[PDB]
Design a protein around this ligand. Structure first.
Ligand SMILES: COc1cc(CCc2ccccc2)c(C(=O)O)c(O)c1C/C=C(/C)CCC=C(C)C
Length: 263
């Protein structure tokens, strides 16, 4: 049953999905098509060891560092994409500029792991825009403290992926994440909360329409925000270890600024 209020929520859902498609070149639908073999043309090259890795660059420093810095570079790009998406969220750019920065500072990593789940199955992760696939085992076999960095992301991904969200659901969910009025140091919480409220209403309707047979999906999805926050905490601690153990390893300033005084 459609009414004018439901109609505005659908309109918002459509706008967010449209903006999501425009902002994120590699969607879940593409990632799944690559992962599941809808394919002769979308076949990833698979990196599972040093040789395959060495063969990969065809399609300077220690291996773990190269992978970690490759992972950091994609994060920077993901931040850029998520920032572009944030601006499309109605009301977002009208917020106090300090709050805009705060929302992004705290939101982007949670979004990164949400969307990274789209690129994952239990066996590994799509890399280089889906051209490559790096196995979970190969990542886990990396010298300490690098063998540990991706494992919590995979753990989250397999459980998050069981919700079977599609991109149209995800567009609203990551907008909800960004407009969190509970971020530290926010100047004006009310206008953020009002937008989140609307986004939440939109997400709820979207899940009810897109997944009618999936009971309490909305609640189950919101509960995942806990898993995301914990992933972020561990990551930052692991980064502190890296800083001290790999003094010769540069961290991208954008990421360094984001990490500066997190929770
Ligand atoms: C294992 O983590 C890597 C490593 C890499 C580096 C793999 C690599 C390393 C050395 C030489 C060739 C390839 C990439 C990449 O290059 O695209 C990558 O996308 C990832 C995925 C991980 C992330 C945290 C990126 C998050 C991305 C999104 C939310 C869209």
């Amino acid at each position: 049953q459609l009414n004018p209020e439901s109609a505005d929520l659908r309109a918002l859902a459509k706008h967010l999905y449209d903006s999501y498609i425009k902002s994120f070149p590699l969607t879940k639908a593409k990632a799944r098509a690559i992962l599941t073999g809808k394919t002769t043309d979308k076949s990833p090259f698979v990196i599972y060891d040093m040789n395959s890795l060495m063969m990969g660059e065809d399609k300077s420093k220690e291996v773990a560092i190269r992978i970690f810095q490759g992972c950091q570079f994609r994060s920077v790009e993901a931040v850029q994409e998520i920032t572009e998406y944030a601006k499309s969220i109605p009301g977002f750019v009208n917020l106090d500029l300090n709050d805009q920065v705060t929302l992004l500072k705290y939101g982007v990593h949670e979004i990164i792991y949400t969307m990274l789940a789209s690129l994952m199955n239990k066996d590994g992760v799509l890399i280089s825009e889906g051209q490559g696939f790096m196995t979970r085992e190969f990542l886990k076999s990396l010298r300490k403290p690098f063998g540990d960095f991706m494992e919590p992301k995979f753990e989250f991904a397999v459980k998050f992926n069981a919700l079977e969200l599609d991109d149209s659901d995800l567009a609203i969910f990551i907008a909800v994440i960004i407009l969190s009025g509970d971020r530290p140091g926010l100047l004006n919480v009310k206008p953020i909360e009002d937008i989140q409220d609307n986004l939440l209403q939109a997400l709820e309707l979207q899940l009810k329409l897109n997944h009618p047979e999936s009971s309490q999906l909305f609640a189950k999805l919101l509960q995942k925000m806990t898993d995301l926050r914990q992933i972020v905490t561990e990551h930052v601690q692991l980064l502190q270890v890296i800083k001290k153990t790999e003094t010769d390893m540069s961290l991208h300033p954008l990421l360094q600024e984001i990490y500066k005084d997190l929770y």
